[PDB]
Design a protein around this motif. Structure first.
Motif, PDB file in Angstrom:
ATOM      1  N   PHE A   4       0.831  -1.214   0.000  1.00  0.00           N
ATOM      2  CA  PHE A   4       0.000   0.000   0.000  1.00  0.00           C
ATOM      3  C   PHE A   4       0.862   1.260   0.000  1.00  0.00           C
ATOM      4  CE2 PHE A   4      -2.390  -3.404   2.003  1.00  0.00           C
ATOM      5  CZ  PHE A   4      -3.547  -3.382   1.215  1.00  0.00           C
ATOM      6  N   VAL A   5       0.438   2.267  -0.771  1.00  0.00           N
ATOM      7  CA  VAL A   5       1.146   3.552  -0.817  1.00  0.00           C
ATOM      8  C   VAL A   5       0.170   4.660  -0.436  1.00  0.00           C
ATOM      9  CG1 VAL A   5       2.529   5.126  -2.182  1.00  0.00           C
ATOM     10  CG2 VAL A   5       2.616   2.678  -2.656  1.00  0.00           C
ATOM     11  N   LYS A   6       0.514   5.441   0.585  1.00  0.00           N
ATOM     12  CA  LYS A   6      -0.346   6.549   1.018  1.00  0.00           C
ATOM     13  C   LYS A   6       0.175   7.877   0.469  1.00  0.00           C
ATOM     14  CE  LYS A   6      -2.797   4.935   5.078  1.00  0.00           C
ATOM     15  NZ  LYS A   6      -2.672   3.560   4.519  1.00  0.00           N
ATOM     16  N   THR A   7      -0.758   8.760   0.084  1.00  0.00           N
ATOM     17  CA  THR A   7      -0.397  10.072  -0.454  1.00  0.00           C
ATOM     18  C   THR A   7      -0.570  11.164   0.602  1.00  0.00           C
ATOM     19  OG1 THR A   7      -2.588  10.694  -1.247  1.00  0.00           O
ATOM     20  CG2 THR A   7      -1.267   9.262  -2.671  1.00  0.00           C
ATOM     21  N   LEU A   8       0.002  12.297   0.282  1.00  0.00           N
ATOM     22  CA  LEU A   8      -0.060  13.457   1.172  1.00  0.00           C
ATOM     23  C   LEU A   8      -1.495  13.945   1.342  1.00  0.00           C
ATOM     24  CD1 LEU A   8       3.034  15.285  -0.211  1.00  0.00           C
ATOM     25  CD2 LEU A   8       2.845  13.835   1.831  1.00  0.00           C
ATOM     26  N   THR A   9      -2.384  13.570   0.416  1.00  0.00           N
ATOM     27  CA  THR A   9      -3.781  14.016   0.490  1.00  0.00           C
ATOM     28  C   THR A   9      -4.668  13.011   1.219  1.00  0.00           C
ATOM     29  OG1 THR A   9      -4.423  13.130  -1.652  1.00  0.00           O
ATOM     30  CG2 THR A   9      -3.406  15.315  -1.618  1.00  0.00           C
ATOM     31  N   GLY A  10      -4.076  11.906   1.673  1.00  0.00           N
ATOM     32  CA  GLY A  10      -4.823  10.902   2.435  1.00  0.00           C
ATOM     33  C   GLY A  10      -5.367   9.763   1.580  1.00  0.00           C
ATOM     34  N   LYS A  11      -4.867   9.664   0.350  1.00  0.00           N
ATOM     35  CA  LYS A  11      -5.322   8.597  -0.545  1.00  0.00           C
ATOM     36  C   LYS A  11      -4.436   7.367  -0.371  1.00  0.00           C
ATOM     37  CE  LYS A  11      -6.556   7.489  -5.266  1.00  0.00           C
ATOM     38  NZ  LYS A  11      -7.998   7.421  -4.899  1.00  0.00           N
ATOM     39  N   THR A  12      -5.010   6.163  -0.481  1.00  0.00           N
ATOM     40  CA  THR A  12      -4.209   4.930  -0.357  1.00  0.00           C
ATOM     41  C   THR A  12      -4.279   4.152  -1.673  1.00  0.00           C
ATOM     42  OG1 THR A  12      -4.647   4.793   2.007  1.00  0.00           O
ATOM     43  CG2 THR A  12      -3.858   2.806   0.901  1.00  0.00           C
ATOM     44  N   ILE A  13      -3.116   3.786  -2.225  1.00  0.00           N
ATOM     45  CA  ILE A  13      -3.069   3.016  -3.477  1.00  0.00           C
ATOM     46  C   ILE A  13      -2.551   1.605  -3.200  1.00  0.00           C
ATOM     47  CG2 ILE A  13      -2.515   3.197  -5.927  1.00  0.00           C
ATOM     48  CD1 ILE A  13      -1.491   5.854  -5.573  1.00  0.00           C
ATOM     49  N   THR A  14      -3.163   0.606  -3.843  1.00  0.00           N
ATOM     50  CA  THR A  14      -2.731  -0.785  -3.678  1.00  0.00           C
ATOM     51  C   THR A  14      -1.974  -1.214  -4.931  1.00  0.00           C
ATOM     52  OG1 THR A  14      -4.661  -1.272  -2.317  1.00  0.00           O
ATOM     53  CG2 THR A  14      -3.479  -3.138  -3.271  1.00  0.00           C
ATOM     54  N   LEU A  15      -0.804  -1.829  -4.750  1.00  0.00           N
ATOM     55  CA  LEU A  15       0.013  -2.267  -5.891  1.00  0.00           C
ATOM     56  C   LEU A  15       0.378  -3.739  -5.755  1.00  0.00           C
ATOM     57  CD1 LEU A  15       2.270   0.859  -5.873  1.00  0.00           C
ATOM     58  CD2 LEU A  15       0.381   0.364  -7.441  1.00  0.00           C
ATOM     59  N   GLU A  16       0.551  -4.418  -6.891  1.00  0.00           N
ATOM     60  CA  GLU A  16       0.981  -5.819  -6.878  1.00  0.00           C
ATOM     61  C   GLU A  16       2.470  -5.814  -7.193  1.00  0.00           C
ATOM     62  OE1 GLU A  16      -0.769  -8.339  -9.707  1.00  0.00           O
ATOM     63  OE2 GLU A  16       0.052 -10.143  -8.860  1.00  0.00           O
ATOM     64  N   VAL A  17       3.279  -6.370  -6.292  1.00  0.00           N
ATOM     65  CA  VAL A  17       4.729  -6.387  -6.484  1.00  0.00           C
ATOM     66  C   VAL A  17       5.343  -7.709  -6.049  1.00  0.00           C
ATOM     67  CG1 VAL A  17       4.862  -3.908  -6.138  1.00  0.00           C
ATOM     68  CG2 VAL A  17       4.996  -5.468  -4.187  1.00  0.00           C
ATOM     69  N   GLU A  18       6.606  -7.883  -6.426  1.00  0.00           N
ATOM     70  CA  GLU A  18       7.382  -9.065  -6.053  1.00  0.00           C
ATOM     71  C   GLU A  18       8.574  -8.580  -5.220  1.00  0.00           C
ATOM     72  OE1 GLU A  18       6.821 -12.696  -7.609  1.00  0.00           O
ATOM     73  OE2 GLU A  18       5.255 -11.585  -6.632  1.00  0.00           O
ATOM     74  N   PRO A  19       9.111  -9.351  -4.296  1.00  0.00           N
ATOM     75  CA  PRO A  19      10.254  -8.862  -3.487  1.00  0.00           C
ATOM     76  C   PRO A  19      11.453  -8.462  -4.343  1.00  0.00           C
ATOM     77  CG  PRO A  19       9.383 -10.890  -2.532  1.00  0.00           C
ATOM     78  CD  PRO A  19       8.727 -10.719  -3.911  1.00  0.00           C
ATOM     79  N   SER A  20      11.541  -9.033  -5.544  1.00  0.00           N
ATOM     80  CA  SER A  20      12.654  -8.744  -6.446  1.00  0.00           C
ATOM     81  C   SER A  20      12.402  -7.493  -7.281  1.00  0.00           C
ATOM     82  CB  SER A  20      12.901  -9.930  -7.375  1.00  0.00           C
ATOM     83  OG  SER A  20      11.675 -10.324  -7.977  1.00  0.00           O
ATOM     84  N   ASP A  21      11.240  -6.863  -7.125  1.00  0.00           N
ATOM     85  CA  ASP A  21      10.960  -5.646  -7.875  1.00  0.00           C
ATOM     86  C   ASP A  21      11.843  -4.543  -7.322  1.00  0.00           C
ATOM     87  OD1 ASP A  21       9.145  -6.721  -9.561  1.00  0.00           O
ATOM     88  OD2 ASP A  21       7.423  -6.213  -8.374  1.00  0.00           O
ATOM     89  N   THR A  22      12.300  -3.694  -8.243  1.00  0.00           N
ATOM     90  CA  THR A  22      13.127  -2.557  -7.887  1.00  0.00           C
ATOM     91  C   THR A  22      12.249  -1.374  -7.511  1.00  0.00           C
ATOM     92  OG1 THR A  22      13.211  -1.737 -10.146  1.00  0.00           O
ATOM     93  CG2 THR A  22      14.938  -3.283  -9.481  1.00  0.00           C
ATOM     94  N   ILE A  23      12.813  -0.464  -6.743  1.00  0.00           N
ATOM     95  CA  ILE A  23      12.096   0.741  -6.342  1.00  0.00           C
ATOM     96  C   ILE A  23      11.739   1.556  -7.588  1.00  0.00           C
ATOM     97  CG2 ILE A  23      12.328   2.905  -5.083  1.00  0.00           C
ATOM     98  CD1 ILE A  23      11.829   0.410  -3.402  1.00  0.00           C
ATOM     99  N   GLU A  24      12.660   1.621  -8.553  1.00  0.00           N
ATOM    100  CA  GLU A  24      12.391   2.345  -9.797  1.00  0.00           C
ATOM    101  C   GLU A  24      11.183   1.711 -10.481  1.00  0.00           C
ATOM    102  OE1 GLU A  24      15.469   2.297 -12.616  1.00  0.00           O
ATOM    103  OE2 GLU A  24      14.541   3.747 -13.911  1.00  0.00           O
ATOM    104  N   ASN A  25      11.093   0.386 -10.413  1.00  0.00           N
ATOM    105  CA  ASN A  25       9.967  -0.306 -11.038  1.00  0.00           C
ATOM    106  C   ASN A  25       8.680   0.071 -10.307  1.00  0.00           C
ATOM    107  OD1 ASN A  25      12.148  -1.417 -12.258  1.00  0.00           O
ATOM    108  ND2 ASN A  25      11.322  -3.447 -12.397  1.00  0.00           N
TER     109      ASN A  25
END
Lengths: 72, 72
Positions: A4-25
């Motif tokens: 989950f990623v939270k924004t400064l405006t109070g919004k929460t985004i859900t993402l599908e990732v793998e432990p091997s994913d890079t931050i840039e990705n």
């Protein structure tokens, strides 16, 4: 795994990732969803700024972890 | 007793704690649930930053108290 990623405006985004994913990705996934260019995004986890050349596993980010997004 | 922790993204987490639990222990519980390393977390209650060497009772935190989580 899902994260989950939270924004400064109070919004929460859900993402599908793998432990091997890079931050840039991860930033790229956010760009696709929110239209925010990666160069304007700063990701923080447990008080630490995440680097674009490292992976999620390097920061021991586990399923259902919440990251914080900052805008510059 | 149950306590609540709010995130910068507007999420609220419920935790089970005892007055004798340490702040470091509380951070550890948050790590388990959100994947945020304790060194990247800052806990605030009633405007005061809580220290890792003190307990909940020291800050007179009572049942259904709400703490604020900050990321660094």
């Amino acid at each position: 795994m899902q994260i989950f990623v939270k924004t400064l405006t109070g919004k929460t985004i859900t993402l599908e990732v793998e432990p091997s994913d890079t931050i840039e990705n991860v930033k790229a996934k956010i760009q696709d969803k929110e239209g925010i260019p990666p160069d304007q995004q700063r990701l923080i986890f447990a008080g630490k700024q995440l680097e674009d050349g490292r992976t999620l596993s390097d920061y021991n980010i586990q399923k259902e972890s919440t990251l914080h997004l900052v805008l510059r």
